[PDB]
Design a protein around this ligand. Structure first.
Ligand SMILES: *C/C=C(C)/C=C/C=C(C)/C=C/C1=C(C)CCCC1(C)C
Ligand SMILES: *C/C=C(C)/C=C/C=C(C)/C=C/C1=C(C)CCCC1(C)C
Ligand SMILES: *C/C=C(C)/C=C/C=C(C)/C=C/C1=C(C)CCCC1(C)C
Ligand SMILES: CCCCCCCCO[C@@H]1O[C@H](CO)[C@@H](O)[C@H](O)[C@H]1O
Ligand SMILES: CCCCCCCCO[C@@H]1O[C@H](CO)[C@@H](O)[C@H](O)[C@H]1O
Ligand SMILES: CCCCCCCCO[C@@H]1O[C@H](CO)[C@@H](O)[C@H](O)[C@H]1O
Ligand SMILES: CCCCCCCCCCCCCCCC(=O)O
Ligand SMILES: CCCCCCCCCCCCCCCC(=O)O
Ligand SMILES: CCCCCCCCCCCCCCCC(=O)O
Ligand SMILES: CCCCCCCCCCCCCCCC(=O)O
Ligand SMILES: CCCCCCCCCCCCCCCC(=O)O
Ligand SMILES: CCCCCCCCCCCCCCCC(=O)O
Ligand SMILES: [Cl-]
Ligand SMILES: [Cl-]
Ligand SMILES: [Cl-]
Ligand SMILES: [Cl-]
Ligand SMILES: [Cl-]
Ligand SMILES: [Cl-]
Lengths: 242, 242, 242
């Protein structure tokens, strides 16, 4: 509940503000977005920062933060560590929206979109399971491994059929740019988890781990959404003719 | 757990019965519904009261009811209030079904339907967060505000592309009728929350707040479903030719 | 937490291994699967055992297992029984994937698929509610009944429009085979629940109830997925031309 750690607190308030600014910027950027495909991607994009603000409020309020006892074998075994589990939970809604926006832009098959969102949800929930598991270190990492497997299913779409769809949709250029951002930035999350306090605890500062995720969110969500939306606004014809 | 409040109890049992009657009435009304679009909307409609009964059983049984301590600043700060949080949770399944039924009727784009359901889920979960937050009054209302934002995303579809789709689908007349019912009745829920015990507590009776939601459910679900289904039965050609 | 019951333990470890073997077998079987419809169903199929392993890890670790006090009237009223509620929870992700795979194979309408998954989720969550309800025996069984109603909605699709779609998709033969497996095997789950400790408790052994579900999973998931995938690999043309 209580929080007397400026490093930790700032990592949360900073994104409530940035997500707030993004929403306002995006609403504005869509001021003259033609109806149909464009406006639709605009809405899906607007919600990325909307879900994000919700996540940070959950954390700030303490609603989605808890103390978890680390199991034998862990660097901090027998100690209680602060787990921002609300991040893992909300990702289950925000990442599917990122994929929805990218999917619409690439005009992929509804079936493919379906499979990818399911895989994404699996990645998120198994990640939450890894954080919440306390009986044995083995199970925490086994969940981490399965979460990685779901992540691979998600990435497989980006490297295969979603790319072929963007080409036929005339959005290959922007898709290729956005694809690099997703693969590189999304890989940062499991690294932070593994290096941070809930993983190997190479970095034992909860404030530091929190800032890492917050910085990733700035680029994987706000900047990502800005780049996607800006392109759509300057290429309404191409996306509308889908 | 215990409940010795007839006002409160009746508000729940009344809808177990009404939802039960609706199911039977709807199954009957679909007795001679031709396969395809019609029968499909019939099924989606049948589940609205099915999910509803589930919600009321959760409440009646006490499974989805809990005591929450109100934070400083609240009219009942320092007191425990009864929170029917199961309502907020089940809305996450029932409202998407209402939107699914309306979406099929209007024959909207799968992508649009997707975005709307996601926004709807966000509205529901942030509403639950508002009710469950106890650390500060500020966060309870911040969640209420974000939930309203998601609600606006949902309504935006009804006022734009979903309406244009119904027109091209030849279902503009029934859609326009159903749209008014959704906008007006759905607006009643955040008013009840704000006026009731979990919000401003202008009305401090949990029994009264419960009845308000129950009455809204009767119209937003049962009556709404009746009107939609009855039209579909008398206009199978128009919906089937979609 | 603690578990000193070989009968119970083996029922869980056995499927971590079998689900692990299935994943490896399926990845292999897809080695030369042409892109498009085939590869897509391959991915959806690969995740069935992926979600399954996740479920068993939750159970093995104790994360998704709890003690529930049975209400008056129950054969074990006033006693605490072990509830593998993680099974019910994960089914909410794995069963929709089974239906997704079957739906893609049958090339059904996106709207129908949507309605079926929602009904499936309802069946799973009401089943979880039945297990978690402790105030009265009446409510436990009322949830069981509603869950059955959702199950009927799911089955209705398999006996109607999904079958007509498979015919037009040229996949009627494999669909008919898979449909029998789903109807017969899926019916086994509510029987186990009713006969086992959480239901009528005709069988009071948690180890025995666990093995029943595990055996059902072997056929409803692993064998089912094998049959589906093998057919797709030998009939790529038919599925691709969808
Ligand atoms: C807006 C937030 C985003 C884009 C978050 C992305 C999160 C992931 C790619 C998380 C992945 C993880 C694994 C692959 C292994 C288990 C631990 C996680 C959940 C951090
Ligand atoms: C069957 C039940 C229905 C149609 C329920 C609808 C509920 C809403 C439109 C709820 C909306 C709310 C907000 C916009 C603000 C936060 C509080 C809520 C969850 C009551
Ligand atoms: C991989 C696991 C599968 C295919 C599980 C299927 C589960 C069901 C068909 C469960 C159904 C139930 C009812 C119809 C009544 C309430 C109890 C349940 C949840 C066991
Ligand atoms: C998919 C990758 C899985 C890697 C599993 C790593 C399991 C080791 O686990 C690690 O062991 C260290 C030494 O005992 C501890 O200090 C760390 O806290 C602990 O997380
Ligand atoms: C989107 C609309 C947000 C409105 C935020 C209202 C915040 C005020 O909150 C209200 O303050 C009153 C006086 O202190 C209390 O009596 C009420 O219980 C409390 O909810
Ligand atoms: C859809 C089918 C619903 C069946 C409802 C059955 C309700 C009876 O419930 C059963 O009663 C027995 C005798 O009292 C007990 O021994 C069992 O434990 C209890 O589950
Ligand atoms: C278009 C389909 C989207 C499906 C999304 C499925 C998963 C929903 C996850 C909801 C998480 C909600 C928790 C919010 C918590 C918070 O921010 O306080
Ligand atoms: C389909 C969306 C449903 C919305 C569910 C919202 C609430 C999620 C609650 C998750 C609780 C799990 C974390 C417990 C953490 C702890 O031990 O404190
Ligand atoms: C067609 C997609 C629909 C997606 C629905 C996603 C959200 C599921 C919410 C499930 C809530 C289940 C809780 C039921 C509680 C009860 O009534 O006892
Ligand atoms: C995707 C669907 C998942 C189904 C999840 C069903 C169970 C939801 C449990 C929500 C618990 C949150 C409320 C806690 C309330 C309290 O403090 O008593
Ligand atoms: C294609 C849409 C699929 C929608 C799926 C909606 C329901 C998600 C259910 C997630 C359950 C996750 C719990 C996993 C628990 C565990 O194995 O440890
Ligand atoms: C949309 C997916 C959300 C993922 C939610 C994952 C966590 C589910 C937690 C369910 C808790 C309900 C069971 C409580 C059992 C008990 O009493 O021990
Ligand atoms: Cl988020
Ligand atoms: Cl924190
Ligand atoms: Cl409801
Ligand atoms: Cl109540
Ligand atoms: Cl499962
Ligand atoms: Cl167990």
């Amino acid at each position: 509940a209580v929080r007397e750690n400026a490093l930790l607190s700032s990592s949360l308030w900073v994104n409530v503000a940035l997500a707030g600014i993004a929403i306002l910027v995006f609403v504005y950027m869509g001021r003259t977005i033609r109806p149909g495909r464009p406006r639709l991607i605009w809405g899906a994009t607007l919600m990325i920062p909307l879900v994000s603000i919700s996540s940070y409020l959950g954390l700030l309020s303490g609603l989605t933060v808890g103390m978890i006892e680390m199991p034998a074998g862990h660097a901090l075994a027998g100690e209680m560590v602060r787990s921002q589990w609300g991040r893992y939970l909300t990702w289950a809604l925000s990442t599917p929206m990122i994929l929805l926006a990218l999917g619409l832009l690439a005009d992929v098959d509804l079936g493919s979109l379906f499979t990818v969102i399911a895989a994404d949800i699996g990645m998120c929930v198994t990640g939450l399971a890894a954080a919440m598991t306390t009986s044995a270190l083995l199970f925490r990492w086994a969940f981490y491994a399965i979460s990685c497997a779901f992540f691979v299913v998600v990435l497989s779409a980006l490297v295969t059929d979603w790319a072929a769809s963007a080409s036929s949709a005339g959005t290959a250029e922007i898709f290729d740019t956005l694809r690099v951002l997703v693969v590189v930035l999304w890989l940062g999350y499991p690294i932070v988890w593994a290096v941070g306090v809930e993983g190997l605890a190479l970095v034992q500062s909860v404030g530091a781990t929190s800032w890492a995720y917050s910085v990733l969110d700035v680029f994987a969500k706000y900047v990502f959404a800005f780049i996607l939306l800006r392109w759509v606004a300057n290429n309404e014809r191409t996306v509308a003719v889908a």
